[model samples]
Target: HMALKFEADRTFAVKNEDGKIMGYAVAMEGKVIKPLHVKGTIDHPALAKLKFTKSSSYDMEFAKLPTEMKSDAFGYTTEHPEGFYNWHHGAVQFSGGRFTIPTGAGGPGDSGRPILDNSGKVVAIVLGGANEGARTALSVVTWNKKGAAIKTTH
Candidate 1:
């Protein structure tokens, strides 16, 4: 509870027949892997110029407020996150005591994900696909609680 955060080697690549990057996309293509092959090479042309962009996004529209409580015995301030595992927009949420995750894609019978809620409107974005499975069990949740100015202690 003392100022939480970090990053990881989250992005991987998709390779071409000659072992080249073919216009990057998320490491997935729906519920399946790209069904292509990546070579053992890393110094490819695309790798040299890869630029992570602001393509990452979140949309808090039909979100619901957190239904949980705090341990300090107060009702918890706005800075209080609903759960530790963040939730994104447009994916059904899976939340527990210290975590929250949005559901993802599966295909024909698979329902799409749900976004997070704020004051009764959606306010978080959920990543919508899996790199290899039905839908991933995780997402990078983000939100803009529109600053009604609520604060809390860690």
Candidate 2:
């Protein structure tokens, strides 16, 4: 399974099972990956497709924590007429009792989000805005990132 890791300043680093560096989860510029709500796109499936508990009600989710803690979900300032300081949050996919996590920027009501993959019960958390046109994404804190500080055998 591909994976990622959260490093300094909440940056994500990709890694192999043996802890080999692969890549990094870039910071968000204008959007969020929070699986808590549906994205604006109608072409894709629902956020629950990533097995994120179908609802945070299934378990005490991490996003729920940050929200409770009132943590400022690092996000980019937008030009929306609503106001400035557009926000983001962490996207989380729940499977096997573990949470797949990603950052977010939206708040209150439904916000821009990511798509979930049922095959792996993982949410393809959007790291930033569209790249090449389509929404760019990565597995939130996947196995690839967790191995960053780990060791592998040959």
Candidate 3:
């Protein structure tokens, strides 16, 4: 391993319909030609700004801890209709080199995965990586559900 390490589990978000920046939420998806959205509670809070921007780079060693070594940490990645993707504090596990993502969403990768709505909007975040396999992929509710909570700078 190297003497220095850069590890992060951060999320960001949105210039609204009117281009106003709402407060932040977290996610479990990816971008580019195959984009996935972020989801969270509808009435949670009006964000003036999203505090953390998702990182575009990851060293291979960073993915090693959570996926292979069974540590208490995880990596994150997001999508969007509205609802907390928080399952037991957005916790996830990987074993036998394969993780179980919910049906219809993409597989969990070193980056993360997406959970989608019936209308194809992302509604949850799957924050984990694999020792090997990876991909991308999610669903729904109002803001108050508080099913899970992502970290926010607030």
Candidate 4:
């Protein structure tokens, strides 16, 4: 469960508690571990094959409000004619129930992607971009409460 490998563009099938396939997620570059973000409730037998460390609500707030911290985001966008997932580097800020990443960090087709902390832990899931200044994301805490199974490595 601890030897999972993630290459760029690697995809994982998302599922629910009943082991029903819901969607998929792409792996993004990371420092310590590759993070995958998927929408909807996620629970799959395959998830047992990988090691995941659940994030606490405190971890979300700590990652968001820190001025010196930065995060990594990845997703496909209309701007990419090739349609490969692209990475966006930025800091995060708490926005009500969700969180915000800097402008240009997210866009169309970017929803449901992972926003990772410097340690490569997924802190949020992209919701969408609202304007030119920021993009919104579902916090890891919220996603967990929603039934997300796969998380980050400890």
Candidate 5:
């Protein structure tokens, strides 16, 4: 099944079946991936796992997304108001959870967001908007169908 996960600043010891961490996301991102991390921490059990949990009562799929997409301050700054704080038209662009969303900017890079499929069960990581004149990396989602990185993989 397709899946998504997000948290404040936590890291999971992605242990192999033998319980050996193949490589930590933190370890992997240190030089090439840039930034210290991509989200959260799990230091104290009492602090609770800072993760995005699915809604128990909702019907559609939603993710606890960071305001920043490719840029550093999409939703956080006035010059980059493409964050969750604003709403853009988004939709499923393919089966098996591919999506298209219009970033407020309306440019190719400016338009991308996630929307649920008709089933309200499938979800996706989107990097292109759905509106007219919108384009992606020439069917990247169609071709690659997956994203990868030291701190994230989808």
Candidate 6:
């Protein structure tokens, strides 16, 4: 039996130097946050140094994709944690540093929600929905390996 934990701070708004709300990002270990890759968000050059508002603390960990079984995976949004769909192994795909999951699993304001595996380790951060029900995410393993290219501040 697998259970989910919500000890960390919920998704927060990612702001720019000018105080404009760029988008959202999620908190991980070491006070580092992961920004969403969708357009009209943190994908721009102006977002090089991000400002995070409403900071808080929690302990979370990341892991590579499950090589054996992929079940009991779930994700949430800032607005609706209960609205996320239960993702089975067949409905999820990881490739090219992104994860493809059922759409409603995440949406607009939910970009930074952590997608956890059955063991409660974060595997991806919600990006946004590709369609009405198909959502995409940034893989944690890939991000940790190369996310340093994007500079950011607390």
State which candidate has the highest lDDT. 6
On lDDT, the stronger of 1 and 3 is 3
In the order shown, what is each candidate's alpha-carbon RMSD? 17.7, 18.9, 17.3, 13.2, 16.7, 13.6
Model 2 worst lDDT run, 10 consecutive residues: 78-87
Residue 54 accuracy (lDDT) in model 5: 32
TM-score of 4: 0.34
Q: Which residue pairs show collisions in model 4?
A: 53-152
* lDDT values for all models: 0.27, 0.27, 0.29, 0.38, 0.25, 0.40
Q: What tens-digit string does per-residue lDDT give for candidate 5 at 48-153?
A: 2224333222211122323332222121111211222222344323323323333344333221232233432212223333444553221111112242211111
Q: What is the Cα root-mean-square deviation between model 6 and the actual structure?
A: 13.6
Question: Which stretches of model 4 miss by more than 4 angstroms?
Answer: 1-87, 95-97, 132-141, 144-154
Cα lDDT tens digits for candidate 2, 14-118: 344555433232223211133322322221132112222233331111222122212323333211121111113443334443322333322223222323332
The lowest-lDDT stretch of 10 consecutive residues in candidate 1 is 28-37
Number of the candidate with higher lDDT, 1 or 5: 1
Q: What are the per-residue Cα lDDT tens digits for candidate 3 across 18-120?
A: 5443322333222110112322222213222223333322110011122322332222223332233334224222223223334323322212233334443
Candidate 1 per-residue lDDT over residues 95-126, each given as its tens digit:
44122333332321121122334432323223
Which candidate would rank higher by TM-score, 1 or 2? 1
Better of 2 and 5 by TM-score: 5
List the candidate 2 regions with Cα displacement exceeding 4 Å: 1-8, 26-72, 79-154
| Model 4 C-alpha lDDT per residue in residues 14-106, reported as the tens digit of each score | 565666654444343221121233333323233334444434322321112112111322322111111122234456655444355556665
Residues forming the 10-long window of minimal summed lDDT in candidate 6 = 55-64
Model 6 TM: 0.38
Provide the TM-score for each candidate, comma-separated.
Answer: 0.23, 0.21, 0.23, 0.34, 0.23, 0.38
Ordered from best to worst TM-score, the candidate numbers read 6, 4, 1, 5, 3, 2
